[PDB]
Design a protein around this ligand. Structure first.
Ligand SMILES: CS(=O)(=O)c1ccc(CNC(=O)c2cc3c(s2)C2(CCN(Cc4ccccc4Cl)CC2)OCC3)cc1
Ligand SMILES: CS(=O)(=O)c1ccc(CNC(=O)c2cc3c(s2)C2(CCN(Cc4ccccc4Cl)CC2)OCC3)cc1
Lengths: 248, 11, 248, 13
């Protein structure tokens, strides 16, 4: 909501609204990800992924990331207040934040018991991604999901925290910074109210720093520039156009 | 930002 | 090869060449596909696929089909004679035949014993594809793979037969039909020579009539037009550009 | 309707 001086009733309604927008666009139900924890890639399947060409593995990951971003775009379209921002600001917020929201949501698909992530129907470790040729970035993404796994978020906490990762009034290029600041503040009141009622405000000091998410996004953009030099026709022929627009 | 714009106006 | 009056030595060399081009671009190893036959999607996994949105299921299948087409383009680039045809004819042959070659190659991933296909890491029946909204086309594709299954092709037979599905001198729009006729004839000599040496010429009268492959391709183009009317932004945002160029 | 992508894939080598 963009309402100035939002009352306690409005903040409680905003907590409910944000949680419902997230539930309708969460992509996979948490119970489905948990039910599949015993479905792990066999050693022969891992060898098969590691044998794939770099272009084939980049194309698969770009497709899966694009599908996850499509759900974040729908989350934004349903998020209280987002469609009241100007067209430019909506685009500036999604271009800088859709990838960051996906990286946060991905902690639900990470199993700390065996350090594996749900990918293409089964759970696999970072070794599954070897053919991409960006081991440092993959290892950093697994470490980031591991840091969020340790905070043990509920679905409601993910909904309120991802709304704030997206509604960031400090993004360069915003034209109505003051309007985004009001929406960000109301979402912060909603997140803090939910955390206070459930005795979870102690997680605020444990959230990843202002810089961790930007580093992962900047590394992705850098590795894609290296990939596009080695395979300049694969991107224009097979990658999703939304992916090329956001990261090229 | 032609694609993001179209996704935002799609209903 | 386009060489006129190909000798028996040239025909034997062409059999070896076509089999090698196919082996280098077959996408998945036959032994991996066969050894995964007993791994079938559970009823809950099937329900999960059936609960996906139409746009998500179409986008996934367009991606998998595009990856399979990319291997057929590399098969064509390595196929003896293909790169000696004019640029227009190469495009006419791939635009009409890439999808037909993929449909033939997919008989390797089909189990006739339980009517399942290898898809996204496990085997599943046609019910897995229900969210696409084109049950009749999916049933026709499963029937086509079932008709090829009955011939129990070797890998060498698939290589020689798929070369002929692609090098078809009757495709409308060819500008140098005489060169395509010559290349088609040499590939037919190579296919017939291989079949004669292995006592398999009896399969020639059992190969599917050309109209069958034409019908599957035409139905796919029609179902994509129906999909694009219901979801006009999904295609331009997320589908592979090669897919939109070949079928839109 | 268009063949720009197929053309580029074919001339990649
Ligand atoms: C949202 S959810 O919880 O409902 C859900 C979770 C999982 C899934 C299925 N799994 C996935 O789609 C992925 C798992 C992982 C994915 S996507 C990548 C993303 C980052 N990413 C960039 C990159 C880096 C280097 C090269 C290319 C790319 Cl796109 C790498 C791949 O990180 C490794 C793990 C569906 C839904
Ligand atoms: C070639 S291989 O042997 O190395 C190999 C075998 C299996 C695999 C993994 N499995 C697949 O990629 C697919 C299995 C099936 C596939 S792709 C489709 C293709 C037709 N097709 C169009 C469509 C019809 C209707 C609507 C949209 C589309 Cl794209 C439907 C999907 O037919 C159903 C089965 C990879 C490689």
């Amino acid at each position: 909501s963009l309402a100035p001086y939002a009352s306690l009733t409005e903040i409680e309604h905003l907590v409910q609204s944000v949680c419902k927008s997230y539930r309708e666009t969460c992509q996979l139900r948490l119970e489905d990800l948990l039910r599949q924890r015993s479905n792990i890639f066999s050693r022969e399947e891992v060898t098969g992924y590691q044998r794939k060409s770099m272009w084939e593995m980049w194309e698969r990951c770009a497709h899966h990331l694009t599908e996850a971003i499509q759900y974040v775009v729908e989350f934004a379209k349903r998020l209280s207040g987002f469609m009241e921002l100007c067209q430019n600001d909506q685009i500036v917020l999604l271009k800088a934040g859709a990838m960051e929201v996906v990286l946060v949501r991905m902690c639900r698909a990470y199993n700390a018991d065996n350090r594996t992530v749900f990918f293409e129907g089964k759970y696999g470790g970072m070794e599954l991604f070897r053919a991409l040729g960006c081991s440092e970035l993959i290892s950093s993404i697994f470490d980031f999901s591991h840091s969020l796994s340790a905070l043990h978020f509920s679905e409601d906490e993910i909904a309120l925290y991802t709304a704030l990762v997206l509604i960031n009034a400090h993004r360069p290029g915003l034209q109505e910074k003051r309007k985004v600041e009001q929406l960000q503040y109301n979402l912060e009141l909603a997140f803090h109210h939910h955390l206070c009622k459930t005795h979870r405000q102690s997680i605020l000091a444990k959230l990843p720093p202002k810089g961790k998410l930007r580093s992962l996004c900047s590394q992705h953009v850098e590795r894609l520039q290296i990939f596009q030099h080695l395979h300049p026709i694969v991107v224009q022929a097979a990658f999703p156009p939304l992916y090329k627009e956001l990261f090229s | 930002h032609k694609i993001l714009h179209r996704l935002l106006q799609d209903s």
